[PDB]
Design a protein around this ligand. Structure first.
Ligand SMILES: *N(C(=O)N[C@H]1CCN(c2cc(O[C@@H](C)[C@@H]3CCCN3C)nc(-c3noc([C@@]4(C)CCCc5sc(N)c(C#N)c54)n3)n2)C1)C1(COC)CC1
Ligand SMILES: Nc1nc2c(ncn2[C@@H]2O[C@H](COP(=O)(O)OP(=O)(O)O)[C@@H](O)[C@H]2O)c(=O)[nH]1
Ligand SMILES: [Mg+2]
Length: 169
């Protein structure tokens, strides 16, 4: 049977959650995607020789801590916590997203990857060392991405699948 991995992409508005998801799905950079569209997209991929089905939830809805929103986020097996390297506030929000994931999954060990997006841009405000160190503090991997150039896109989603595999085993 083909294993399906449910991946959820989270982070502050405008960090590039949709552009990253669409690069994985379409193999195309989409600079404009309605910031309110929250949807799931599937793609069959080969990761370490195993053909698997990715189901990616690209988050966008209003901040809401209700039984309904918690249950929808709880379907995720692994999470990408995205910030933009030129937006300090998005990096400073990361701990909130991790805390909410741990809470809905009722687990101290949820497969997770820290993603520093917009790596193509020159006006960086978050040092790579600070981002590597945040990931080190949590015991999770860190991946530098650009949805514009496709830098790190497969690395981010594929590392998350590998983290899910380790957790299940
Ligand atoms: N974009 C904009 O403002 N978008 C909205 C929609 C999402 N959103 C938001 C804000 C937020 O803020 C916290 C960091 C902060 C801490 C104190 C309370 N608030 C104000 N947090 C979230 C958020 N946090 O967790 C989520 C999840 C989707 C992550 C996975 C786990 C769970 S479980 C659960 N329930 C939820 C939820 N909700 C999550 N989301 N979201 C702000 C703009 C762009 O304009 C430009 C308009 C500003
Ligand atoms: N230069 C650059 N712009 C990006 C990148 N990813 C997203 N963007 C831009 O950032 C803005 C928000 O992207 P979007 O995917 O809508 O973010 P979301 O709200 O997290 O889904 C848009 O203007 C995008 O063109 C990237 O890696 N590089
Ligand atoms: Mg979006």
């Amino acid at each position: 049977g083909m294993t399906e991995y449910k991946l959820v992409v989270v982070g502050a508005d405008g960090v590039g959650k949709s552009a990253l998801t669409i690069q994985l799905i379409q193999n195309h950079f989409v600079d404009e995607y309605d910031p309110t569209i929250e949807d799931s997209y599937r793609k069959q991929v080969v990761i370490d020789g195993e053909t698997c089905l990715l189901d990616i939830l690209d988050t966008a809805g209003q901040e809401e801590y209700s039984a309904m929103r918690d249950q929808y986020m709880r379907t995720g097996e692994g999470f990408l916590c995205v910030f933009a390297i030129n937006n300090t506030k998005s990096f400073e929000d990361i701990h909130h997203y991790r805390e909410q994931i741990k809470r809905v999954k009722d687990s101290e060990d949820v497969p997770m990857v820290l993603v520093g997006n917009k790596s193509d841009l020159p006006s960086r405000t978050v040092d790579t060392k600070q981002a590597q160190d945040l990931a080190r503090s949590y015991g999770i991997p860190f991946i530098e991405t650009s949805a514009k150039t496709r830098q790190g896109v497969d690395d981010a989603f594929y590392t998350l699948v590998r983290e899910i595999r380790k957790h299940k085993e």
